[model samples]
Target chain A: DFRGYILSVQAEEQKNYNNSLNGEVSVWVYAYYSDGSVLVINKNSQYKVGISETFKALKAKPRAIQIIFSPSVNVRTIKMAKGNEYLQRSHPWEATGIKYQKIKRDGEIVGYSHYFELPHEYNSISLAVSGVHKNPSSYNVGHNVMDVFQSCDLALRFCNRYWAELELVNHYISPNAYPYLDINNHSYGVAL
Target chain B: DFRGYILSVQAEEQKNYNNSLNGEVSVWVYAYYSDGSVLVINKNSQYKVGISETFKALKAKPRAIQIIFSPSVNVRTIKMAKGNEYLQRSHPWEATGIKYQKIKRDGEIVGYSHYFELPHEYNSISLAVSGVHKNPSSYNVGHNVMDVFQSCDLALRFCNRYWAELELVNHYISPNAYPYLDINNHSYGVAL
Candidate 1:
């Protein structure tokens, strides 16, 4: 399920932008995921070892390092849309609003991001991230490495365990339910 | 629930467009039950009649009038977004995509038409129709009415019934359990 492969990191290299070297670089290189638990080869890690030596080391240490790390899902790829705040506030029964957070490298946020989409109404949901594979020889093959595994269902299940604690929908239910009902037309029958 | 309220209908005169004067029109409304039974209102009833007059007439001359015609769900507001090809497919799980039909005037369509927003997954999904009530004076009052009744449950129940026949989703099991899994560490789920 986990294997070492190339990954690509498409990002604005702030380090270069602070100087002249980082001009919105799209770097593609080969790396390996150490195991299912650890991501070994990364952007900053490659710079320290250089591409050729990194690949040689990765090939030598297949089990200790396997799945590639592509710095995808950056600030530009995800942002909240307008008018979603109301939806975030009102439609707790259907969907929640936007969530913004940092993508941590090691333990620090190297990038900020958010996704504006439907909130899962049920307890859990999962989907495979499509369009990850690219030509193996392409310099950017490393960026597409994360695409190797069709997203696992257990990952979503684990997320739901956390969602059960964080979601705060009970606060808005009473006010919003009435407007929803008038628009919908709900008739209740006495139980026999 | 059957307290009578007068409804006014104003017909737009189009003498310049059609060059005709005899544009007299009659309106017929029917009430229906959840069991697919039509609660018979009067046949060819005059819209000019007061609500009391119409109700009394329908009750007296009733063939089978068990429900009131609240004029809710009797009308649907639809729109077509330009160049939205996804709205064109009509698969059962996906949106019934955009298609043109004659515009209706009390069950009769006019010269203009547009397509429907297509669904991508899950046939017969709940779709969003924006600006549905352009001038929802009645809707505003209905919200108050809902408040007066203190029945938010009615709305929730209404939404539940609206898609009751579409499809059933398993909450406990299913691969797509929690789609909003955190992209990084799976720590934060997708925002709404």
Candidate 2:
């Protein structure tokens, strides 16, 4: 039933060539819904798009969310300053995982989270941002995002394995009131 | 005190040749106790020895255990047929982490868990294995355990940071009855 709602999902990469050594690598997911609505999710150091807005636009409800890491040997976390020029704060973040979310508003479901299909344990996911710069003034400061999702095409392929499951339970809404759901079970809603 | 019981702690690595493309990597821990006893712990796909036995021989008790990923970006898991040539099964496993334990027998308070002193969040650790082989026939096929603890030198250095903690609580024995130990709450023990 939820299958028809997805039009297409795409992952885009942005690279800063000159700053390769300390450049930023950023991966973004573009979800094209069947309703002609598109949602862009950035796995950045800061939450560029508010979680609430993402859910509302997608017309999905919250089921459960998970954190996962990319299965790439190139994935690692580095400490860097992550604030704007006015104020900078240093923190360590990894370039990993597909960040997904779902939402509901006005007593009606709006949007849900989406991720590429991948075979990964729940704990393998990481929320670390990629492409960290040592100094805020560095040329690669803004260009530190990752090129591939985490590593390369292989990392992206690894994630695609979970597409079917992602669609099945994109949002948690049952026809029956108070539908029983156990997120910790790892089965998601497959058996149910 | 628990400090006197440790003889030496070593982390060793093994690599396979020929099947270098699909070679296996493994890391092992050898803890030599002062009582002329040696305890070997493998961070393998399966737990080779019982946790209690390892604790007993080491004269230590189980403190909290942590699952930490190596700091190296090259670490990843692969799925392949494992087992003997006659019988095989496929599973995904990583080569990672320090496997430490302790036990007590006959209520005499025999052994205790050991770890290095480090400031870490309980859940922040990962048990991801290292050194995965792409093919079952790789040189290290059956032995593809992880090489380092998590990522790289940083992972090793991070692990090294805990040596002080390991020395602090190598063995657990109550000097009296109901020793009033705090499990989740940080205070290991304080006079009531």
Candidate 3:
């Protein structure tokens, strides 16, 4: 869903604002969840730019984006950031097409890991992050953390289209029993 | 090998720029290759912002970034984009620790492919882009590009020591089908 073009005005004309001109430009998402909850991101005090502030030059999907504008400052060019998707009302993000697979090293069962398979249309970077859990106790943690395991050459790899793959390296370890896999691909993860 | 910071300014004053913002932020790398060539990126007509524009609020790893500033326009928040590392003059970004893995389907060897094992420090989001060849023949051209599997996925996992564990562990591909570069949460590919 493309929203009307947006513009964030900058302050007085200090032509050479000496800052590192390297970063992403994007709008904010006001996500409404299924459980009567609302979440917004890529926002700060609602005044990164004023409400309805017109930008200098911009491109890409901006029809559904919400803007807060004021006419006191200005900026020139803007580009769309990732995960700026149109969130549906009361339609929270979730892991769908959940499944599991097995891993083996010497034809010996090493792990059984769980993973997700969702569509890119239904997913966003904001939704993909919820897949990983730093803490082991978290539900559906996509990654397996190692502590004091036999040090070995370990690697994990995935594709470029926002796909996620999990690797289970614990040949003989798992604090509990979770599917120990080597790759985890999330639907937010796209494959080519 | 750290360069100064960089900044790009926005135009006049009118806040409330509503856009679903996201994407990575990074500076241009003016890379001088081993073959006596210089290449610069993250630059748009040398002015995403003015040459040497001072920025408003930013964070994380700013030493190696390059900016252009004036002193008229302004932007509030920005973080370092991916691949803004300190690239040495004449030291082009290459795919180090390259190797291959054997992929199997239905207990038969179906694919043998090559991949990269690059350090996050040495590899930039800019550098990693070269690994995925849109065309199969580009792999031989060697921009760290992978011919069979173009477009390496950069998972959120950190597996340094120049290690790439690409067993595609939990992912399953049907035989006689082109294997997709599985995007996952465990690894960011530096080469294909």
Candidate 4:
């Protein structure tokens, strides 16, 4: 199951914060995964996160505010820019940060192709991306990335859960399919 | 177009009120739409909203929290009973609330189908509603309905802007030869 927590704090003084504000306030925000992995997203971070609050004046003193949370609201996108400085500092072995070029025909994002290089030792790579539908914005942002992360978690969980079952079947059938076997040598033949 | 605001607030008493607890903590909120519509979705409202402040004890204060607004949120399936009630009651008229059903396969809602009584002037009535791609859950909570509303607005805008061309075609084409025309004379055209 996917889960999250929302944390809001009181600032001594009011200031506009968040990407939508066009650099007016210092937004105080961070997100932590269920496993306690935390990513601080704000103007300081290379990534962008969208906030729902419209930033309006309050009638009451000390401005009583309301913050909302639900299973649905989460990271929209995670953008790590490939700054010129980073490119100048990187070695050929470690390429600059990844970039995305959306394949669009008309206005729809029919398919997305990602460009990233992984370590050679990593035989199989799994991407942990938030779901495409976690944040509500005309454009994707960091908060939406939560869904991608959750979806990735689910995918990994399913694969790991079923790994043993596949192995049991493979060992019982074709034990010779080595390269085609799964990470644990569990082939579809054995799983079937 | 339908428009609404989301707000969050918090207040602390200079002096403790309830045994070390902050005194008189409460949150109130409301949403307004372009159609002279206002929904006071506070603590008592069907949907919930919240906020986070990390400076202090990492406290989360919730006021009439207008829940998170995301493109991925599915307003139709909000967990709140009141959210469902509002959706059901808002429809013009129908038995058992909205007189609609969701079409699902493998636990995923593919589409929504609804039936309504035809106006008294019509001889016979049949209704069909078809949608492409379930509204991504990200926008479900607040923006889903807004997106639909915006799309409808866009449709109307297009129809009005192209009325001259449409009229020209209509005038030139005979009723019997209209490709979409039928003996029943119950046909409509759409372009998006």
On lDDT, the leading prediction is 2
Q: Write the per-residue lDDT of candidate 2 for residues B147-184, one digit (tens) a residue.
A: 32222222221111123333323442133221111224
Q: What lDDT score belongs to each candidate, Candidate 1 first? A: 0.20, 0.25, 0.22, 0.23
Q: What TM-scores do the predictions have?
A: 0.19, 0.19, 0.20, 0.17
Off by over 4 Å in 1: A1-71, A79-159, A162-192, B1-34, B37-100, B104-192
Candidate achieving the largest TM-score: 3
Model 2 residue A190 CA deviation in Å: 26
lDDT of 1 by residue, B72-185 (tens): 111233221122135566432322113322333335232122222222332222222211222233244423231211111111100011111112122210222211111121
> Per-residue alpha-carbon lDDT of model 1 for A1-192, expressed as tens digits?
223222112223443332231122111121222221211112221110111111222212222211111232222222111110211122112211124343343353333222223233322111111111112222232323233122211112100011111121122212322111111222111110
**What is the Å distance of residue A99 in model 3 from its true position?**
39
Interface RMSD of each: 25.4, 18.8, 18.8, 21.1
Can you give the lDDT of residue B60 in candidate 1? 20
The CAPRI category of model 3 is incorrect
**Candidate 3 wrong stretches, greater than 4 Å:** A1-27, A43-192, B1-92, B95-113, B116-192
Model 2, residue B192: C-alpha shift (Å): 54
Q: Write the per-residue lDDT of candidate 3 for residues A46-129, one digit (tens) a residue.
A: 111111111111221112222211111122211111231211111112222133233444453332233333232442332211
Candidate 2 per-residue lDDT, tens place, A4-56, comes to 44422211111122123322222333333334333333322110111111222
Error of 1 at A5 (Å): 20
- TM-score rank, highest first? 3, 1, 2, 4
Ranked candidates (lDDT, high to low): 2, 4, 3, 1
Q: lDDT per residue, candidate 4, B1-192, as tens digits?
A: 223222111112212221121111111122212222222221111111111211101112111112222111233432211110111011211122133344343353322233222233422211111111223333234334444333323321001111232342354223312212112322322211
